[PDB]
Amino acid sequence: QFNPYGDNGGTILGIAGEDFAVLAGDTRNITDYSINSRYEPKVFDCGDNIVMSANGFAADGDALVKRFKNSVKWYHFDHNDKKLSINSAARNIQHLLYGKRFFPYYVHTII
Amino acid sequence: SRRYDSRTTIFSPEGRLYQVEYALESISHAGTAIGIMASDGIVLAAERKVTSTLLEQDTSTEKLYKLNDKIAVAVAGLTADAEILINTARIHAQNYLKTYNEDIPVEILVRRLSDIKQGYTQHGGLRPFGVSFIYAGYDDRYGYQLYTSNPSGNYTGWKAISVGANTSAAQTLLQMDYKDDMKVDDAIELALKTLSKTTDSSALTYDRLEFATIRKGANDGEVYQKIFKPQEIKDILVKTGIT
Amino acid sequence: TDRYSFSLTTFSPSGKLGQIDYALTAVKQGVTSLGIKATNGVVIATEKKSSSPLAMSETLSKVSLLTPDIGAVYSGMGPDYRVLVDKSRKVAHTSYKRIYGEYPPTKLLVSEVAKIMQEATQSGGVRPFGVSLLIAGHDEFNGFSLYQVDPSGSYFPWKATAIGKGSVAAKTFLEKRWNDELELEDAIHIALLTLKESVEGEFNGDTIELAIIGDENPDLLGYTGIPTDKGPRFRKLTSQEINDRLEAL
Amino acid sequence: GYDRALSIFSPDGHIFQVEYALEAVKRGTCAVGVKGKNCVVLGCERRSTLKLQDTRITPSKVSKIDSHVVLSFSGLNADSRILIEKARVEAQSHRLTLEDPVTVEYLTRYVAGVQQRYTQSGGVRPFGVSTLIAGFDPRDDEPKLYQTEPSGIYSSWSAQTIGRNSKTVREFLEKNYDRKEPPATVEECVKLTVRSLLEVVQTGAKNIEITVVKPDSDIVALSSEEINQYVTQIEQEKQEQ
Amino acid sequence: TGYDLSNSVFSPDGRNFQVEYAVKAVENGTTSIGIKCNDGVVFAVEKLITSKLLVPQKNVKIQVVDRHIGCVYSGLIPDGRHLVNRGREEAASFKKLYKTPIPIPAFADRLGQYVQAHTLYNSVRPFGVSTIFGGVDKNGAHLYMLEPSGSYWGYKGAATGKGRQSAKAELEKLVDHHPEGLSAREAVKQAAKIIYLAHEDNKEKDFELEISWCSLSETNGLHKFVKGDLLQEAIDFAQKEIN
Amino acid sequence: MDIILGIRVQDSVILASSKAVTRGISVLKDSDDKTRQLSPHTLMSFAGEAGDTVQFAEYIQANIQLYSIREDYELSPQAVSSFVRQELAKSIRSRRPYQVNVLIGGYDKKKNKPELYQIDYLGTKVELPYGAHGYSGFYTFSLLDHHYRPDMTTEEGLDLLKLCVQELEKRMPMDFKGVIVKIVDKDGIRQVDDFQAQ
Amino acid sequence: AGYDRHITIFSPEGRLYQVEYAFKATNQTNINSLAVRGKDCTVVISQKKVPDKLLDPTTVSYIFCISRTIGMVVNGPIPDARNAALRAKAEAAEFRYKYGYDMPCDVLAKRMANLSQIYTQRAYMRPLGVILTFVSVDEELGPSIYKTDPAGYYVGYKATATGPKQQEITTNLENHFKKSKIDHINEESWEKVVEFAITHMIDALGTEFSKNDLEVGVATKDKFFTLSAENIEERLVAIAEQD
Amino acid sequence: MFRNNYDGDTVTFSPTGRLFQVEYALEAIKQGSVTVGLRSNTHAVLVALKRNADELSSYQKKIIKCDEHMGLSLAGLAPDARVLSNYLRQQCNYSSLVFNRKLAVERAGHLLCDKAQKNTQSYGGRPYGVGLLIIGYDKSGAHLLEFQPSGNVTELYGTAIGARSQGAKTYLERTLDTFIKIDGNPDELIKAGVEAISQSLRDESLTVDNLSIAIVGKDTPFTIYDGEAVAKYI
Amino acid sequence: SEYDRGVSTFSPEGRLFQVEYSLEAIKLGSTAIGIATKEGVVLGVEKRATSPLLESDSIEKIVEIDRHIGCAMSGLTADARSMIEHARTAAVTHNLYYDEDINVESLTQSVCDLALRFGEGASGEERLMSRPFGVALLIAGHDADDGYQLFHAEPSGTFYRYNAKAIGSGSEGAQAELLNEWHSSLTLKEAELLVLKILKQVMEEKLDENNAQLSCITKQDGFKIYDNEKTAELIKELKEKEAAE
């Protein structure tokens, strides 16, 4: 029986300050009881002043983010390099995620 | 020169659909067929057109057909176009029976067919049916009913109608003698008493006919549908005005 | 020329589809062929013409077996007939034998074939078949039968008739010497004397292809043990059986 | 010439094929819709010219689409039967997906939607029908009356007519129908519909069909006598002056 | 004539003019030549510098297929690239199935069959180019030249384009005074020569020469582009003889 | 399951149908009408799976109504139930079948006779003098086998039906929150809002 | 005013000229071919004209090997014939696969005369302008020869001819067969039959041939082979004296 | 007398071997405004002359981005360009996500040629009516191309297309030796482009409202200078 | 004479006449006028009814696309209903995906990428609809990035932004007048009397609040279609200033 999912540990955190915001996340990456790398980032700038991190199953994470960033790219292409309002961003991420409602991305994402 | 009759998909400056009109013109080239309503039955009479000395005609038929066990039709126009319809007309008729577990009402069947003929008049790459039909049947909704339909896709209910060749004549004669209550054996009378007058042949020979009727009463609480045999004809034909 | 005879989809002002009649012309041109219904049989025949004697005519049939109780012939465009045939022998299984465990009656095969003939018409983008066939056979409940099928898709039943170049008269000859009684041997006769005038070539055993529907051949099966499976009624006469009946005129 | 296809514009920006379709609506018999302020009345004429036919199941030109909406037309008869069917089904599908029964505009819109769909791609021919849709929306009391053309456009009217000699009947209506004050009685609203056809009917009430529709899915056809009871009362004041 | 409008239509003498006109467009493009040495072949095309604003060494007209087939054409340039991409799939799927890199002779049909096809349907335009190609397989080297009707064969060396005859007579020659396979190296040299001599039809329009070759000994089975030093030599080794 | 009763008398059909609606632990409603009128003289009660139940009912209702304006004639009880059994019949062999059982009781103005058809989700149809779906039968069928007579008055049927309910209450584990009754006849449908107002 | 433009329209006399014109194209080949059958072999003859010192003749034939028993010769353009050669070449493969045995000459010709009929009635493409001649040694008829054309025709030949010279090569044979009163050439081995054709052809054309002006293939007891380049010179020698 | 029964469809060869429908297409490129492009060994430049309707309407742009390292200017039918530039944006994105390598400019030519290709070989349609000058900066430094509706993409050093474009191309053909060497300095490579474009004005002169510019190179991701920002060149 | 019968046929001088005729279809519509002001944007149209029995509001010549975008069309009405429909769906969808309002030009954009779908034959993709739409659009809206904008959509597939523009039978004289009136510091009430004035001028019939419809859009209240009483007095208040000077 082929099981398409895996858990690469990790933890991320996001606090919203009065006029700034942070998003942290350790660098360790694991598989069962072993180590795969002591430094493998899980927090990226996606452009338009927006940080994002998807934590859970390594691969689904990388996928979502890549898929999100390629999306910011096209939002500019179609609306005159207009800036992506972070609220407009989350609404968009919803659709990305719900896109796979019946073969879900095994991750907890945070922008 | 330049005319607006090149196809069905084209309105002439005056909103005419020539291609359809020409099909309606193909009918006047068919053997005369008649249908007469009666207080107790319906009569279908036709006059085989095609002819030759060696042409089998005592077995097979060409103008009268059974669609339902309670509905019959007279054909007139393109032979092949007639079968294509007649068949689907039969399938539809059976689906109604298979769904409602009741027999299909006449007008419904005539309407379904007229609705297909309608369609071949509005879509490109299609040629309208070069057929005309006289439907004679009975249902518990409106007793006996006589209907007619042409290539244009319109249909209507007559008390006595004729289609085919010399419709003007046949139509005229009827318009005259038809007594509104007229019994069946008087319609079968009037059938020939009209077909005769509008023929050509030195004499009206039996082998050149097709009769069928629909009767019912208290007896068989239902309808009996008969398609006369070469025999009965050659006979009832003499009983009238032929040696 | 009209401006209406170049479209299957077009009605002339009177009401005549055009392309059909010109198709029906290629037929009224083809080599003469006839069919006679007897009382205990039916005969279908058509002539043969050689491009050159360097060609083997005994590898190209003209009288074909559709079902072991039905055969058919033609007059018009050669090539059409060849495949119109194989499509007929199939629509005979897929449409009847495979649903009712038995072969089809004459009437319905002729109509299943006119059905394929119909398609060629109703539809621009294709041309109708330039052939007209005489199909002859017999089925239990209907006795023997004779039918004609034209590109127009229509089809009729005769007692006797001919189609082709020399038909006007051949169809005149027959008209005279036909009556409800002719036994099969008589028909086979009356046929040759009509396939006679309708030729400019010769009258041997090869240039004549004739077959007939008659009695069952308990020999032509290949097996024996099952009572009801008795045999095929269709018999295509051989080059020999012929010229013998030619000597006795 | 440029009037050969639906997909070609003439130099001046026309599309004649669609225009010619309309020339056929004029061929058909006359229909006329007249609304009051508590009702709507449709009227027609019967092609009573060549009869020795039945009578029982004779078309009334007016058809119900739902319990609260009726439709009347003019033009290619056979063409009309399909629009009437298609609109009937849609009327029932709307109830199935929204509980609420259709609105008179939603129906008109759906119809004209179809009529326009048949002037899009080639290898299709525009319906030769023009129609009048009248009725009352669900739980509403404002009378409504719309008209649709073969081209695909729809419009609402206080009163309107289509078909042969619709120019005449229209003139009449125009100088009689008061925009500021519509017929306040079903009886007078009828009277007005009748007297208008009585300029193209060629005498007799044997050539006039009248159907009345009020609120609450309450619709009702008219009989031959009732209809004559007006031909009567209007043939009086006619020479009365 | 009404027989030169459609692409499928046969003229009364069984002539398909649309394909013929196709050729007229081919014998007007630049000049392309193909040399078949002993083991491997040599290709060369005439590139035309219209203006001084044309980065040189760029805008290549010779394409490799897989990694062992040379390929050059003349006529409609876009039609060119096209016919080749197909060849590139046709190639690839073949190696993915049989493992062994595609047989130069096999390859040609694939292309013919394809060009073939664009002469069958009236909804498409025949290929507007003549193509020359070849490479080294298991049976050594081969050199073909396909054309607008899909017709083609094997050659000792050939060429198409506005100036092809001179290319031919000065080509047949090399055959006569060498009946036994030319020379790997030498081919290139004599190649750059055969172009100049043929360019005298574009004389007033300074040009740039492009040569590629494929050989079991110099290339090592693979098709490579003749750039660098041997590229110069071959030019002068031709510029000298041009005097 | 829900309660679905029906009985044909002298000249009319009567339909009983429990009022409660339950989602798991609670009872979201105790006044639900499991009925749905297909036409002036045809009525159809239903009971089955949560969602499937009324999606289907309405669907059927829509088809009948469509047919009725189109033909301007009213489809008969016999033909109406025939159509239903057709659909459900096709349903059972489809990606996902409706799990709905029904009762159709109309008045055939043509024969002037009341008729009651009982159909289950499999497409099994049968004409009966009285019927019920699910477990509803075991508690009643014997009482009706005992007292039912075809000559019964509408007035007598109700009295009978009352007994069956009283029994359903005394021995059935579920509390169906009462029933709603309805009568079909030559004059159409009306609701006996007095078996509830009692 | 364009009957002859469309492959689907009948002239008032049921002609379909597009199919007719198709033929003239089967002649602009300018190659003649005759095929005669031995007693356990079959041989086809055809001239090999190569008008260019550049084309390497190895790739210049009009006879291909459909299957390991059947061979084919074509009287038409190398592009079109190369097509047909392929389809048939594949019908073979599939037939075997679907039926357990090697496909007969007589059949393959019918799949083609049929294929080029549907090809021609549905109008899905223009008819190929070539004539196909199928030869082989069947295991139920050995010396077998069938020939199909563009109009979807075919038949058996005791030995036939095709080219710009029908009658000559033909009549010449009709008088040689008019004597032997049999329907085949008598001889124990192919070698000798081959010699018979060349022999009996030069007679009709009036010209000598070398080891490059001709081209022949033959069929044995299941093993079709093309005659070698040099080997064709052989029998040419042997029959240059036994005159 | 004097017809041309060979120009009705893109799918018909005239007796000499010409595709007239395609030819007519180019003719529509000539009817459009002018645009210029030129590049050195560190940058590429697009200079375009936007056109307009009334003194009330806006000037229709003609520079289009495609990636951080690529873009083009157009002449002719605006819509066609949209479709093309768009197909291009797609091709670059694929080559970016999948392989993670910036699409080389030459490749973008092949791609725009093979797409323009299809429209000259089939029935029913028409050829793109628009020319483009593409610029970019891959691993081979600067790059400039010139595509025509016939599918002919040629790589130049400079050029112009549009009505009167002629004069500007001439100029560029002389100043060549000069600019091909303007490395490290963008401000001068543009002043060059602007000079060359003025060689094509006849009506007016370039104002801040109708001038558009764009650059890309070594350390300059494709950016577009519009209006009030191109003032230092007017 | 011969090249104007195919929507995919270039004339010898690179022209597509069928498209041009398309436009010529609009001139037949009645006039529509749009004037943009730093205060908001105004849209006005001549109704022009054949009869007094028509119901005015039956003629939707000005409609809402969304709370912040409205428009007026001119040309074939059936063809309009289809664009208006697409436009509305375009707006609403974008809202759904982004939780924000679609930029006026990005909307206008999608409207043109629709007309761009004409042509029948099959050379690759597929865009089912034979010819060009016969109508133009005046799209008045407002968004946080570029403020009050006004656009002109043509079936050609292109569009320009305007300060003021007029379309329809009268766009000839109307556009001239507007060229000599419009100025950046126009108040909203000022533009209303101007749109109203130019119609009356190059219109025809006595300008009554029945044959003339007027609307406007603002940041504050979005798209609102002036009711009859307002427009009515705006007309009186207008026709008055004509007495003196």
Short mmCIF file of C-alpha atoms in Angstrom, two decimals, chain H:
data_model
loop_
_atom_site.label_atom_id
_atom_site.label_comp_id
_atom_site.label_asym_id
_atom_site.label_seq_id
_atom_site.Cartn_x
_atom_site.Cartn_y
_atom_site.Cartn_z
CA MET H 1 -10.16 42.09 -66.47
CA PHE H 2 -7.22 42.19 -64.02
CA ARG H 3 -8.13 40.14 -60.98
CA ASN H 4 -5.98 38.23 -58.53
CA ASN H 5 -7.55 34.87 -57.80
CA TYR H 6 -4.70 34.00 -55.47
CA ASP H 7 -5.21 36.36 -52.54
CA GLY H 8 -8.41 35.06 -50.99
CA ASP H 9 -6.91 32.72 -48.39
CA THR H 10 -3.68 32.27 -46.52
CA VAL H 11 -3.91 28.74 -47.84
CA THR H 12 -3.21 29.42 -51.52
CA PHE H 13 0.02 29.70 -53.49
CA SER H 14 0.07 32.19 -56.35
CA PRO H 15 1.68 30.87 -59.54
CA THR H 16 5.04 32.34 -58.53
CA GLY H 17 5.09 30.91 -55.02
CA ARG H 18 3.82 33.82 -52.90
CA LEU H 19 1.34 33.99 -49.99
CA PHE H 20 -0.48 37.30 -50.58
CA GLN H 21 -2.70 37.23 -47.48
CA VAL H 22 0.51 37.14 -45.41
CA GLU H 23 1.91 39.97 -47.50
CA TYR H 24 -1.14 42.13 -46.86
CA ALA H 25 -0.59 41.48 -43.19
CA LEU H 26 2.88 43.06 -43.18
CA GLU H 27 1.24 46.01 -44.90
CA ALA H 28 -0.76 46.61 -41.71
CA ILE H 29 2.47 46.74 -39.70
CA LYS H 30 3.61 49.60 -41.96
CA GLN H 31 0.41 51.49 -41.17
CA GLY H 32 1.11 51.46 -37.44
CA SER H 33 3.26 53.81 -35.37
CA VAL H 34 7.05 53.55 -35.15
CA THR H 35 9.15 51.82 -32.54
CA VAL H 36 12.90 51.38 -32.17
CA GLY H 37 15.27 48.98 -30.49
CA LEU H 38 19.03 48.85 -30.20
CA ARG H 39 21.48 47.19 -27.85
CA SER H 40 25.13 47.14 -26.78
CA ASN H 41 26.90 44.50 -24.70
CA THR H 42 25.31 45.38 -21.40
CA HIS H 43 21.76 46.51 -22.20
CA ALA H 44 18.98 46.53 -24.79
CA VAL H 45 16.50 49.33 -25.42
CA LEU H 46 13.01 49.87 -26.70
CA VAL H 47 11.82 53.35 -27.66
CA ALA H 48 8.28 53.74 -28.88
CA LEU H 49 6.06 56.52 -30.16
CA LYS H 50 2.59 56.08 -28.64
CA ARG H 51 -0.34 57.30 -30.77
CA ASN H 52 -3.83 58.56 -29.82
CA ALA H 53 -7.33 59.60 -30.90
CA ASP H 54 -8.54 62.97 -29.56
CA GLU H 55 -6.85 65.51 -27.34
CA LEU H 56 -9.21 63.80 -24.85
CA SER H 57 -8.17 60.19 -25.37
CA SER H 58 -5.10 58.47 -24.08
CA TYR H 59 -2.03 57.32 -25.99
CA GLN H 60 -2.09 53.56 -26.65
CA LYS H 61 0.95 51.86 -25.17
CA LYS H 62 3.19 49.48 -27.09
CA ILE H 63 5.84 48.13 -24.70
CA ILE H 64 5.09 44.83 -22.93
CA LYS H 65 6.86 42.95 -20.12
CA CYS H 66 7.30 39.16 -20.23
CA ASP H 67 9.63 38.36 -17.37
CA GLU H 68 12.23 40.21 -15.32
CA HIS H 69 14.62 39.83 -18.22
CA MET H 70 12.44 40.15 -21.30
CA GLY H 71 10.07 42.36 -23.22
CA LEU H 72 8.90 43.71 -26.56
CA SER H 73 7.39 46.64 -28.39
CA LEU H 74 4.79 46.35 -31.14
CA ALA H 75 3.45 47.79 -34.37
CA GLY H 76 0.06 47.03 -35.85
CA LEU H 77 -3.03 45.30 -34.54
CA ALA H 78 -2.96 45.69 -30.79
CA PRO H 79 -5.02 42.52 -29.94
CA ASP H 80 -2.81 40.14 -31.93
CA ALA H 81 0.16 41.44 -29.95
CA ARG H 82 -1.68 40.72 -26.68
CA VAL H 83 -2.16 37.09 -27.65
CA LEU H 84 1.48 36.78 -28.73
CA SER H 85 3.12 38.58 -25.85
CA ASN H 86 0.86 36.47 -23.65
CA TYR H 87 1.84 33.16 -25.19
CA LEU H 88 5.36 34.35 -24.51
CA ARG H 89 4.76 35.13 -20.81
CA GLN H 90 3.55 31.52 -20.52
CA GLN H 91 6.52 29.94 -22.22
CA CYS H 92 8.90 31.78 -19.88
CA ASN H 93 6.97 30.78 -16.75
CA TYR H 94 7.12 27.08 -17.71
CA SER H 95 10.84 27.25 -18.34
CA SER H 96 11.11 28.91 -14.95
CA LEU H 97 9.01 26.71 -12.60
CA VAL H 98 9.92 23.33 -14.11
CA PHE H 99 13.63 23.80 -14.85
CA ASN H 100 14.37 26.95 -12.90
CA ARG H 101 16.30 28.61 -15.72
CA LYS H 102 15.50 31.95 -17.41
CA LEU H 103 14.18 31.39 -20.95
CA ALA H 104 16.88 32.38 -23.48
CA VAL H 105 15.90 35.05 -26.03
CA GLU H 106 16.73 33.09 -29.21
CA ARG H 107 14.32 30.38 -27.96
CA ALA H 108 11.60 33.01 -27.59
CA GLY H 109 12.09 33.64 -31.26
CA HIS H 110 11.68 30.09 -32.37
CA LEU H 111 8.60 29.93 -30.20
CA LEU H 112 7.04 33.08 -31.64
CA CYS H 113 7.87 31.86 -35.15
CA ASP H 114 6.38 28.41 -34.82
CA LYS H 115 3.19 29.88 -33.38
CA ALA H 116 2.91 32.49 -36.11
CA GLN H 117 3.69 29.53 -38.34
CA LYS H 118 0.43 27.56 -37.93
CA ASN H 119 -1.58 30.55 -39.22
CA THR H 120 -0.09 30.48 -42.71
CA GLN H 121 -0.73 26.82 -43.45
CA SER H 122 -4.38 26.18 -42.53
CA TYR H 123 -7.78 27.17 -43.80
CA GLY H 124 -10.29 29.40 -42.06
CA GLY H 125 -8.05 31.88 -40.26
CA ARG H 126 -5.80 34.86 -40.88
CA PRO H 127 -2.17 35.75 -40.03
CA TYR H 128 -1.17 37.96 -37.10
CA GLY H 129 -1.03 41.57 -38.11
CA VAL H 130 1.78 42.81 -35.90
CA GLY H 131 5.52 43.07 -35.71
CA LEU H 132 7.55 42.92 -32.53
CA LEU H 133 11.04 43.90 -31.45
CA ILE H 134 12.08 41.72 -28.53
CA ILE H 135 14.90 42.47 -26.13
CA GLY H 136 16.39 40.60 -23.20
CA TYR H 137 19.50 39.60 -21.26
CA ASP H 138 20.26 35.88 -20.85
CA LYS H 139 23.56 34.08 -20.32
CA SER H 140 24.86 35.50 -23.58
CA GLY H 141 24.40 39.08 -22.50
CA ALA H 142 22.30 41.59 -24.41
CA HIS H 143 19.92 40.48 -27.18
CA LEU H 144 17.59 42.07 -29.77
CA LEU H 145 15.19 40.38 -32.23
CA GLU H 146 12.75 41.36 -34.91
CA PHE H 147 9.71 39.20 -35.60
CA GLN H 148 7.31 39.55 -38.56
CA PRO H 149 3.83 37.88 -39.03
CA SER H 150 5.31 35.45 -41.53
CA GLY H 151 7.15 33.74 -38.70
CA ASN H 152 10.49 35.29 -39.59
CA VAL H 153 12.43 36.22 -36.51
CA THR H 154 15.82 37.78 -37.20
CA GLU H 155 18.38 38.86 -34.57
CA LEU H 156 19.74 42.34 -35.17
CA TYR H 157 21.84 45.02 -33.45
CA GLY H 158 19.18 47.65 -33.88
CA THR H 159 16.09 48.46 -35.94
CA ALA H 160 12.70 50.09 -36.30
CA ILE H 161 9.30 49.16 -37.70
CA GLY H 162 6.23 51.28 -38.33
CA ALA H 163 5.32 54.18 -40.61
CA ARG H 164 8.44 56.22 -41.50
CA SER H 165 10.47 53.74 -39.51
CA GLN H 166 12.77 53.90 -42.52
CA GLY H 167 14.69 57.02 -41.53
CA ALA H 168 15.44 55.67 -38.03
CA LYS H 169 16.80 52.40 -39.35
CA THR H 170 19.13 54.36 -41.67
CA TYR H 171 20.46 56.41 -38.74
CA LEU H 172 21.02 53.32 -36.62
CA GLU H 173 22.89 51.79 -39.55
CA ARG H 174 25.56 54.51 -39.31
CA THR H 175 25.80 55.25 -35.57
CA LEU H 176 26.31 51.50 -35.19
CA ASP H 177 30.06 51.46 -34.48
CA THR H 178 29.30 54.08 -31.86
CA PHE H 179 26.51 52.57 -29.70
CA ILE H 180 27.38 48.90 -30.03
CA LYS H 181 30.13 50.03 -27.68
CA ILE H 182 28.07 52.02 -25.13
CA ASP H 183 28.77 49.60 -22.26
CA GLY H 184 28.21 50.22 -18.55
CA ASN H 185 26.19 53.37 -19.29
CA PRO H 186 22.43 53.13 -19.88
CA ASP H 187 21.60 56.86 -19.99
CA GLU H 188 23.63 57.19 -23.21
CA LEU H 189 22.27 54.08 -24.86
CA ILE H 190 18.81 55.59 -24.51
CA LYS H 191 19.72 59.08 -25.69
CA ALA H 192 20.96 57.22 -28.76
CA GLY H 193 17.67 55.43 -29.21
CA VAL H 194 15.78 58.72 -28.81
CA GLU H 195 17.91 60.47 -31.45
CA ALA H 196 17.30 57.62 -33.91
CA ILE H 197 13.54 57.73 -33.36
CA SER H 198 13.31 61.47 -34.03
CA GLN H 199 14.61 60.71 -37.52
CA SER H 200 11.07 59.47 -38.13
CA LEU H 201 8.88 62.31 -36.91
CA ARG H 202 6.89 64.48 -39.36
CA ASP H 203 3.75 65.60 -37.56
CA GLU H 204 4.98 66.62 -34.12
CA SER H 205 7.92 65.93 -31.86
CA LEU H 206 8.09 63.64 -28.87
CA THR H 207 6.40 65.04 -25.78
CA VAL H 208 6.18 63.55 -22.28
CA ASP H 209 2.74 62.19 -23.15
CA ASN H 210 3.64 60.16 -26.22
CA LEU H 211 7.10 58.84 -25.41
CA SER H 212 7.68 55.35 -23.92
CA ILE H 213 11.03 53.69 -23.16
CA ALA H 214 12.25 50.42 -21.71
CA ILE H 215 15.55 48.83 -20.84
CA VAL H 216 17.05 45.59 -19.55
CA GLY H 217 20.58 44.36 -18.98
CA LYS H 218 23.45 43.29 -16.74
CA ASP H 219 22.05 44.77 -13.56
CA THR H 220 18.81 46.14 -14.82
CA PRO H 221 15.69 43.98 -14.76
CA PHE H 222 13.26 44.89 -17.52
CA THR H 223 11.63 48.14 -16.45
CA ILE H 224 9.42 50.63 -18.35
CA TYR H 225 9.72 54.40 -18.22
CA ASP H 226 6.50 56.22 -18.76
CA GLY H 227 5.59 59.86 -19.19
CA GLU H 228 6.71 62.33 -16.53
CA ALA H 229 9.70 60.02 -16.00
CA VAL H 230 11.13 60.14 -19.51
CA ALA H 231 11.32 63.94 -19.36
CA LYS H 232 15.15 63.95 -19.08
CA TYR H 233 15.36 62.77 -22.70
CA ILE H 234 12.76 64.95 -24.42
#
